[PDB]
Amino acid sequence: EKKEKQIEQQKKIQMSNLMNQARLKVLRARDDLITDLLNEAKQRLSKVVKDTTRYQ
Amino acid sequence: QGIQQLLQAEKRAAEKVADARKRKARRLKQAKEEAQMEVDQYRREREQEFQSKQ
């Protein structure tokens, strides 16, 4: 009951740590989808700076 | 004669309480060690439940 209950707890920590890293990977994947959207917006505002009549 | 043969007849019964005690010398010690040999049931159970870990 020490050999069995410890490995059942340690597996259940291991399973719960797997869903934590799976949730944090897809949440961090949602960062770069917004980060490049802000990055390409920074590029497309520079094209407004290039032409003069809309920029002034 | 009478009295000397009677005390030697007692030594048959006087050695019978030694046969009483040797039957509680041997039986006490011999079955303690097969009550020590039941740890082999724990040796086979641990490696069989090691497969449950495996």
Contacts of A3 in chain B (CB under 8 A): 49, 53
CB contact under 8 A, B49 and A3: yes
Residue A19 in tokens? 């869903």
Task: Give the relative orientation of helices B39-53 and A3-50 as an angle to the nearest 10 degrees.
Answer: 20
Closest to B50 in 3D by CA, of A12, A4, A5: A4
Helix (H) or strand (E) holding A18: helix A3-50
- A20 Cα to chain B: minimum distance (Å): 25
